[PDB]
Amino acid sequence: GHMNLCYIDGKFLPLEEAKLPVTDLIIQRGVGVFETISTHSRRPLMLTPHLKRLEGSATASSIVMPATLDEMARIIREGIKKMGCETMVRPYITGGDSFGKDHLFSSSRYFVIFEEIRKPDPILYEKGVALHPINAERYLPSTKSINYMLSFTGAYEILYCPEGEIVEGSHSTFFLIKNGHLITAPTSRALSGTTRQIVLELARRGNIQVEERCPLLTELPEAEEAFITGTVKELLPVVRIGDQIIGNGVPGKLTKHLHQVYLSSIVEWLE
C-alpha cells in the first residue's frame, strides 16, 4: 500500500532499498530526464502526453530510450495498482555509464519512483504563494531535465525572468491575468506543461482570451492575478513576485474559477 516503491532492474523494490550505480552520468554529469505523473481516482492523469514528453526530453538530450513507451506505461500502471492510493509517479531516464564516439548515451538506465501524492497545504491555495524572480533561463526549455540546482541556491518557487521577461517556474508553468486576458510564455521558451495544456483548453471553452507571450516583470503592477500550474499542485495562486504584490494580494476570481473547472473536468484527461 502507502509503501513508497522504486521500479529498477526489472523489480518493484521498497524505495529506501533502490540504488543506482555511481558510474551513471546522472550522478557524475547531471545527465537525466524525468516526469511527474499524478493520479485522480487512482488513474494516471495525461499518461500519454507525459510519456511522449519523457521520450522528447531523452531524444533532445541524445539519450537512447532504455525501454519502450509501452513498457514504461505497463510499469507505471502496475506500480499504481500496487500503491492502492493517490500516487505521484516519477520515471527517470539516466545517461548510463558512457557517452559513445557516436554522440549518444546508449547504455541509459531507468527507474520509476512511486510515492503517495503530497498536494500543497490548503493554506497555500487560500492565501496564495510568493515567487522569487531570477535573471536566468532554462536552456533546452522543452527538456524536463533533473537539473534543479538553481531552484535551491521565503518564496515557494523561483521564476525564470531572463532580461525582465517572465518565462516559468523551476517546477511550474506561470500564468498572469491582466486586462481580463490569460498571459503565459510560449513553449519555444517554457516547458510544454500538461497542466498548461488543460488550462489553455479550459480557457478556450470559457471564451477567455490567451496571449502566448512572456509577461514583463514591469507589467506586474497592472496585473489582477497570477498562478502557477503542475500535475500535483493543479492551479496554485501567486499573490507576490519578489516584492511586487499581485492585484489585491489574495487569490483572484478567475484563478479560483479555472481551478474549480479543472477539478470538475479532470476525468476527461485521465487514462
What residues make contact with a second copy under the rule CB under 8 A? 6, 8, 15-16, 18-23, 25-32, 34, 60-62, 90, 92, 95, 99, 103, 105, 111, 113, 136, 139-140, 143, 145-153
Determine if residue 212 is left, alpha or beta; phi over 0 gives left, psi from -120 to 50 gives alpha, anything else beta.
Answer: beta
> Residues 6, 58, 191, 239: which binds ligand PLP (CB under 6 A)?
191
173 binds, among ligand PLP, a second copy, none (CB under 5 to 8 A by kind): ligand PLP
Give whichever of 108 and 172 is closer to ligand PLP, judged by the CB atom.
172
> Residues 39, 61, 108, 231: which binds ligand PLP (CB under 6 A)?
231
Considering the complex, what minimum distance in angstroms separates the CB of residue 196 from ligand PLP? Answer: 6
Q: Please, are residues 37 and 144 in contact by the beta-carbon 8 Å criterion? A: no
Task: Cell 487560500: give the residue.
Answer: 126
Angle between helices 69-83 and 47-60 (to 10 degrees): 130
Q: Does 171 bind ligand PLP (CB under 6 A)?
A: yes
- CA 6 vs. chain centroid, Å, equals 20
Binding mask 79-118 for ligand PLP (x = CB under 6 A): ----------------------------------------
**Non-local CB neighbours of 63 within 8 Å, separated by 6+ positions:** 31, 32, 33, 93, 94, 95, 104, 105, 108
Across 23-156, the runs of DSSP E, i.e. the strands, are: 32-34, 37-40, 43-44, 87-94, 110-116, 129-134
Site stretch for ligand PLP (CB under 6 A), options 72-80, 119-127, 166-174, 216-224: 166-174
Sign of the Cα torsion 263, 268, 269, 271 reads positive
Give whichever of 144 and 178 is closer to ligand PLP, judged by the CB atom.
144
Tell me: is residue 194 an annotated ligand-binding position.
yes
Task: Cell 535573471: give the residue.
Answer: 135
Q: Does 195 bind ligand PLP (CB under 6 A)?
A: yes
Site stretch for ligand PLP (CB under 6 A), options 114-122, 127-135, 229-237, 254-262: 229-237
Give whichever of 17 and 71 is closer to a second copy, judged by the CB atom.
17
Q: Does 194 bind ligand PLP (CB under 6 A)?
A: yes
Q: Please, are residues 93 and 106 in contact by the beta-carbon 8 Å criterion? A: no
**Distances from the Cα of 268 to the Cαs of 73, 173, 231, 263, 264, in angstroms?**
19, 21, 14, 10, 10
Instruction: State the Cα angle at 54 between 20 and 198, rounded to 5°.
Output: 135
90 binds, among ligand PLP, a second copy, none (CB under 5 to 8 A by kind): a second copy
Q: If you ran DSSP here, which 8-state letter would residue 179 be given?
A: T
Q: Please, are residues 174 and 168 in contact by the beta-carbon 8 Å criterion? A: yes
Give whichever of 25 and 238 is closer to a second copy, judged by the CB atom.
25
103 binds, among ligand PLP, a second copy, none (CB under 5 to 8 A by kind): a second copy
Tell me: is residue 160 an annotated ligand-binding position.
no
Binding site as annotated, residues for pyridoxal 5'-phosphate: 53, 148, 194-195, 231
Instruction: Extract the annotated binding site.
Output: 53, 148, 194-195, 231
